Design a protein around this ligand. Sequence first.
Ligand SMILES: [Fe+3]
Length: 417
Amino acid sequence: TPFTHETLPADPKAAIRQMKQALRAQIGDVQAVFDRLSATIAARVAEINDLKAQGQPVWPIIPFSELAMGNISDATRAEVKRRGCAVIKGHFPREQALAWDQSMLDYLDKNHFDEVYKGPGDNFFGTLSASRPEIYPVYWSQAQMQARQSEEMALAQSFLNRLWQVEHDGKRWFNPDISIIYPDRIRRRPPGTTSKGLGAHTDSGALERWLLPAYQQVFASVFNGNVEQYDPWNAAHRTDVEEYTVDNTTKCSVFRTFQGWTALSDMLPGQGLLHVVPIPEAMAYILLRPLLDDVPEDELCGVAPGRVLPISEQWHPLLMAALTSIPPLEAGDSVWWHCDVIHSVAPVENQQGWGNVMYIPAAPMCEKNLAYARKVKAALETGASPGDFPREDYETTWEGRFTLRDLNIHGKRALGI
Ligand SMILES: [Fe+3]
């Protein structure tokens, strides 16, 4: 269309305007489609609420033993697809997790982190009420890389990728059985912590969801009214997207089937825990909401370039009605959500125990993810901040960092070597 942009429009408001007009036209009665969509989603909220009342976790719980032994049922596979998230209990033995956590402590301590730390290096969350989640951003601890290349991450990554339709056109969109090392940050909250949390948002692009041609491809069924034809699990064209780049701002130049993390400490109920909207199709609602006629013509319900896409009660009351907590967790567990899934971190006052996690996603091998992987390997040598992240570069100088010679067979392959 005349309406799309592959690079960041010089005039966002102008571009948003034209996209809206083009789209209202291509859909017909937007409000009728939104209502239909909402009835399906309202019905899911009924499911979710029902389960909550019973005493169930809403998150599919999948024991790592079954995963490891290939004995996951069809019903479970199905449930993870319905819910868009999964907990892997016992992903790692508690010992191993706790020992990792301790190595983290000493790695930070021995390189004098708390002294040196200047940031946040970034303002990715300016669109959120709770925009300050508790002190990050290191990449190359032995703990992290080990978990990343660990054989039992590989099992989980592969199992997860497998949930996506891969075949479609030109036989295969990515290889679901190798995943790249995507070095990410950590989340470290000590007992006593008080925090606003992280406000509900989705990752992997904001404005580009509407304006990028690849996303017009991905969400065709949405942007043409056949909302029910739309399949969250179809990899079609996801690997053709490339997010807009904004000076020194967090972006994600990689395709992630799931985001997740591995817990380094026990997570106790109410202690400012990860919540998710377990309805991966919600993205449809996010996409149609600004098209409705109570929203200003040049606006996308808070979306701004170089900022995470915000989800709020103001614009998305139904989706907010669906927020659900992770169950309580023991160290070594790990949690996963579909890349289009709305999520947040609840606030705590005076937190019991630690709230430590390592960020490790499933990002499957493909021409796109490999391009980034080639870049990662360069960073891993120097210890610099991976390109996708603010150039803080704290570890370039540190002792006890994971290095090139310490790689797995997995690791060498995940970085394509
Ligand atoms: Fe997020």
